[PDB]
Ligand SMILES: *[C@@H]1O[C@H](CO)[C@@H](O)[C@H](O)[C@H]1NC(C)=O
């Protein structure tokens with residue numbers, strides 16, 4: 747994927763590895779190495795009108 | 797798949813009234829056929 751990884755205060759239970767949105771898109775992951783909880787946000791975007 | 801929960805209740809009215817989810821602490825790749833089960837006592 748593509749996005750910004752941020753430190754999150756989400757409380758994963760120890761067995762959980764992922765976290766998804768309403769549209770079944772992942773918004774939180776667990777680091778396989780350091781066991782960190784990383785929130786994933788899409789990069790900055792927006793409509794442009796002339 | 798084994799799910800466990802330890803809920804210290806105070807009423808003691810057999811199974812209590814309420815909600816308590818169970819978490820998958822144990823999963824074993826046993827691959828066997830299970831039809832009958834029994835418990836163990838000391
Ligand atoms: C894998 O990386 C983690 C984090 O650095 C470390 O704690 C762990 O010991 C490593 N495992 C091996 C097999 O080197």
Ligand SMILES: *[C@@H]1O[C@H](CO)[C@@H](O)[C@H](O)[C@H]1NC(C)=O
Nearest residue numbers: 826827828829830831832833
């Ligand atoms: C397990 O054994 C029973 C016989 O008691 C059989 O009917 C069944 O097909 C076997 N396999 C299962 C339950 O997957």
